[PDB]
């Protein structure tokens, strides 16, 4: 149990525990009334009014095990409806950040601790952040351009936020989970909801592309497979709740993740297609059918590589001509009309197979002439009309073991009108790397001609994108959203 709050009379006891329920006990006949579904467990309850008119209650939102996501709620006692709800943006970090501590329960789970487990986990997290170098915390964040709406892929959910007024406008579940259909108890807390790992839009803005992974329960016969689900949705500008139209189970077959997703631009099919890429190197191009309201596997290039490395990415030429494919130690160029390599009859050594030193993280074209690639040890800026290298910079002394693959892809972005903007993270240390972080956001242009501007920030920054007003948006570890702009 987490909250106990008496009424002003002393005849009613408001109780709140791990299951997402608020129990009003009438102490005379020892009866009760319930609030069973609240989108999160409740830490605190309190009565406010002089006659006891409002119930205030603070919720934990512990589904995000990395970020303890709070929510303030205020109810009329009359109808027991949500009179007022206040909540900030809820990112999904790769690890717990500073002091985030799982609340008290009976069993130490993936979402809770025991008491000896509380002290041990506090010591363990502190020693983890002091010892390790893998502090990434890179969260996926998407931006809907047709409304400039901030989209947060919460764990088995989406939080639609608008930073102009700094308010959460929507919260929507997408997976067939038990987030709201049922609370969770001491032994069910080891069960976890499906993880919606990837979420983007098309340039039309009317099609929402999703990819989640399902986790079967432990200690079973089929506790091994990670069922990969893709979905396409649609919402209007007069609505705010997306509607699913196409479901897809197991793209490219069973148990193979489809980690890299890239939408289509409006130039080829009015941005109604997508490209899905695995560790195997297969590229599947799906497209929305005309006569059928669903999408279809229009194109497919299917290699079958015996090795596996998820350090995969792809970029797309602005006219839809060719596809860059960043693979571990390899750069591929793919024709779009046949899903073959870029066969040039003139043979001017603008080949479709480039060797690189380490695993490629990002490959981004700023136009039809300049391509910047960020591999796990360095960055290289090259031309496309000519196969001549221009720029190169080291990523080794800072990006040493900080991230896994794909995190640089979700980090660095590129604007079509001003150039590229990247990120670096450091920490101030006093004799042990101290917890306090310090990042730098650097603005370049035209395949790193010069630094347009370097700007250090006194704390951590986990995500950077650009709003379509041509202004770049960065996050903090705290849910604070800032902008660099003209």
């Amino acid at each position: 149990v987490l909250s106990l709050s008496f009424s002003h009379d002393g005849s009613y006891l408001l109780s709140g525990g791990w299951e997402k329920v608020m129990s009003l006990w009438q102490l005379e006949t020892n009866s009760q009334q319930f609030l069973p579904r609240l989108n999160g467990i409740i830490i605190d309850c309190q009565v406010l009014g002089p006659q006891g008119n409002y119930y205030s209650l603070i919720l934990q939102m512990t589904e995000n095990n990395s970020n303890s996501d709070y929510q303030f709620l205020l109810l009329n006692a009359s109808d027991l409806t949500s009179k007022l709800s206040i909540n900030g943006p809820l990112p999904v970090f790769n690890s717990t950040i500073k002091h985030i501590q799982q609340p008290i329960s009976a069993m130490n789970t993936k979402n809770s601790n025991s008491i000896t487990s509380l002290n041990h986990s506090k010591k363990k997290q502190s020693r983890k952040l002091i010892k390790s170098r893998r502090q990434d915390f890179t969260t996926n964040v998407e931006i809907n351009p047709i409304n400039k709406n901030l989209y947060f892929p919460h764990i088995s959910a989406v939080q639609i936020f608008d930073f102009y007024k700094n308010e959460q406008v929507n919260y929507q579940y997408l997976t067939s989970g038990v987030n709201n259909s049922m609370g969770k108890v001491r032994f069910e807390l080891n069960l976890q909801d499906p993880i919606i790992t990837d979420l983007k839009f098309t340039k039309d803005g009317q099609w929402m592309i999703t990819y989640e992974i399902e986790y079967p329960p432990n200690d079973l016969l089929s506790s091994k497979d990670l069922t990969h689900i893709l979905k396409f949705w649609t919402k209007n500008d007069n609505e705010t709740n997306w509607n699913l139209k196409t479901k897809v189970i197991n793209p490219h077959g069973i148990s193979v993740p489809i980690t890299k997703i890239l939408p289509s631009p409006r130039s080829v099919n009015n941005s109604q297609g997508c490209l899905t890429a695995d560790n195997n190197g297969g590229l599947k191009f799906w497209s929305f059918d005309s006569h059928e309201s669903n999408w279809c596997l229009k194109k497919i290039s299917l290699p079958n590589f015996n090795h596996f490395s998820n350090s995969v990415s792809l970029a797309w030429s602005q006219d839809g001509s060719l596809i860059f494919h960043g693979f571990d130690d390899k750069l591929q160029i793919l024709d779009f009309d046949t899903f073959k390599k870029f066969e040039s009859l003139e043979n001017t050594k603008t080949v479709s197979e480039f060797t690189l030193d380490s695993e490629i993280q990002t490959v981004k074209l700023i136009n039809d002439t300049n391509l910047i690639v960020a591999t796990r040890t360095t960055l290289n800026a090259i031309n496309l009309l000519r196969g001549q290298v221009i720029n190169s910079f080291d990523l080794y002394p800072f990006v040493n073991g900080v991230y896994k693959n794909g995190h640089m892809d979700r980090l660095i972005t590129c604007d079509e009108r001003t150039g590229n903007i990247a990120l670096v993270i450091n920490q101030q240390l006093t004799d042990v790397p101290t917890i306090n972080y310090k990042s730098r956001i650097i603005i370049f242009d035209s395949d790193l001609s010069t630094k347009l501007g370097n700007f250090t920030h006194h704390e951590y920054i986990s995500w950077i994108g650009w709003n379509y007003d041509t202004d770049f948006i960065f996050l903090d570890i705290e849910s604070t959203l800032g902008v660099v702009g003209t």
Binding site: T81, S82, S181, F187, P217, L220, S222
Partner: protein, 493 residues
């Protein structure tokens, strides 16, 4: 707060030949009533104006049926020998009946006891007789004398036009709904000619060759026509003067073809063609005359017909077979003081200032499994899952949701042999299925790892495990042969 989310039914990936809304509509065409006649029924045609009726030719007889009752409404039996054609007018009042004596008999519907007009064509028996569509008062007949004759009602004793230019056995002719003057005619030589009634006539404007004997011609659109004859059928366009497409997907000689357009259906335009097998088939010109549906009646069908677009009720489809069989496939559609003490409830608030409603609609009633999984009676939900009267996919769904929400151990804790056995009965019914085998494997694995020695102490459950081993080795062989066939597919690609 929020509401309780409804249970998400598990939708499998699509099987081949997924159920189209077109297939849903043609399967909403249910309720096939079968009616006998004496001889081979020849021609069926609906009534245009009020589409609640249709006429059918039969042995020396013309029978008019209603649609809402599907019963013999009118009987025309003034004939001598067997009739050949029956066709209504556009005004829905006169039907013309081509007989086998070379005199056509046209008279009003709903009054069999008057022969309003007895027009005499050539002494050879007449084959087909048709009203005009745009014109109210012109008729066209065609006989065994290989001469088609255009008749006006004012001149019953002499044909107004005598159209010729044919080769052998004129048996179909039709009009175009766009031009009220052009007429198409199909003889036994293929070669549908296109004539004009406002010109001289006896020489066609132009013809288009159907080599096998064409037995039906239908102006499907203002620009396209269909030649339904022989085994195949060729859909031509008059403006390009050329066959746009052709379909030869029919088994026997096609015996009838009709068209219906702009009506209450997912498919806007439907083209039915029946081909002497009971086999009637529905295409659509919107999809370049692609196969969409098909019905099969046993006896070789002779005539099919569809209710028109303005049917304003139950749609109908009939297929008279050569044994004389009509197939009606119908897609169907307190005192004064008490009132004065409660007479205000019908107000509905049209005039007052502020309207307000917080009402909730009545959702679908939950089933036993949904109620029990909501109330967490998990073992009882398992029992209601393995009741006998329960669908396979529905038991699959509740198995999936129990395994996903809770754990199968708490699902299977307090079991005995009598509640273990319906689970395993459902297993022996459904391990053979492709969609469920992994889930059933999870469930049988956890129940064996729980109930190891109770398996020994209970004897018949051992026999269940024996026959389970036999059938699962059958699936072993099936799946291994399947991987073999996949290997030989990899060879052949």
């Amino acid at each position: 707060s929020t509401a309780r989310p409804r249970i998400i039914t598990s939708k499998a990936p699509l099987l081949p030949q997924q159920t189209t809304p077109e297939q849903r509509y043609w399967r909403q065409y249910t309720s096939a009533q079968l009616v006998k006649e004496h001889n081979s029924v020849t021609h069926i045609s609906f009534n245009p104006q009020h589409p609640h009726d249709f006429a059918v030719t039969s042995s020396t007889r013309v029978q008019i049926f209603s649609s809402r009752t599907r019963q013999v409404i009118k009987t025309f039996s003034r004939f001598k020998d067997v009739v050949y054609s029956a066709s209504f007018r556009s005004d829905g009042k006169l039907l013309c009946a081509g007989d086998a004596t070379g005199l056509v008999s046209v008279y009003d519907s709903y009054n069999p006891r008057t022969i309003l007009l007895s027009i005499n064509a050539s002494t050879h028996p007449t084959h087909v007789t048709k009203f005009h569509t745009q014109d109210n008062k012109i008729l066209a007949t065609a006989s065994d004398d290989r001469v088609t004759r255009l008749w006006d009602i004012s001149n019953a004793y002499e044909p107004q036009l005598e159209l010729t230019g044919a080769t052998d056995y004129v048996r179909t002719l039709s009009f175009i709904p766009a031009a009220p003057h052009l007429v198409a005619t199909g003889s036994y030589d293929g070669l549908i000619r296109l004539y004009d009634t406002r010109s001289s006539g006896s020489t066609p404007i132009y013809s288009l060759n159907h080599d096998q004997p064409v037995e039906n011609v239908i102006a499907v659109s203002p620009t396209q026509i269909v030649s339904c004859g022989g085994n195949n059928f060729k859909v031509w366009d008059l403006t390009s003067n050329k066959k746009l497409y052709e379909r030869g997907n029919f088994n026997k000689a096609v015996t009838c073809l009709d068209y219906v357009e702009n009506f209450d259906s997912p498919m806007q335009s439907a083209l039915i063609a029946s081909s002497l097998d009971g086999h009637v088939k529905v295409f659509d010109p919107l999809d370049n005359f692609q196969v969409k549906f098909g019905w099969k009646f046993s006896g070789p069908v002779l005539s099919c017909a569809v209710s028109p677009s303005t049917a304003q009720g139950n749609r109908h489809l009939v297929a008279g077979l050569s044994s004389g069989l009509l197939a009606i496939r119908t897609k169907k559609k307190k005192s004064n003081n008490f009132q004065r003490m409660m007479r205000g409830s019908e107000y509905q608030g049209d005039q007052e200032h502020i309207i307000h409603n917080d009402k909730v609609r009545s959702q679908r009633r939950m089933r036993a499994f949904e109620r029990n999984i909501n109330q967490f009676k998990w073992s009882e939900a398992l029992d209601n899952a393995f009741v006998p009267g329960m669908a396979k996919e529905l038991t699959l769904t509740v198995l999936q949701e129990l395994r996903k929400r809770g754990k199968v151990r708490v699902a299977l804790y307090g079991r005995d042999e009598s509640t273990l056995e319906p689970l395993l009965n459902w297993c022996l019914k459904g391990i053979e299925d492709v969609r469920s085998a992994s889930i059933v494997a999870d469930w049988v694995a956890v129940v064996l790892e729980l109930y190891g020695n109770t398996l020994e102490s209970s004897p018949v459950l051992q026999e269940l495990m024996i026959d389970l081993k036999t059938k699962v080795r059958h699936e072993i062989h099936k799946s291994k042969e399947a991987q073999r066939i996949e290997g030989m597919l990899q060879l052949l690609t």
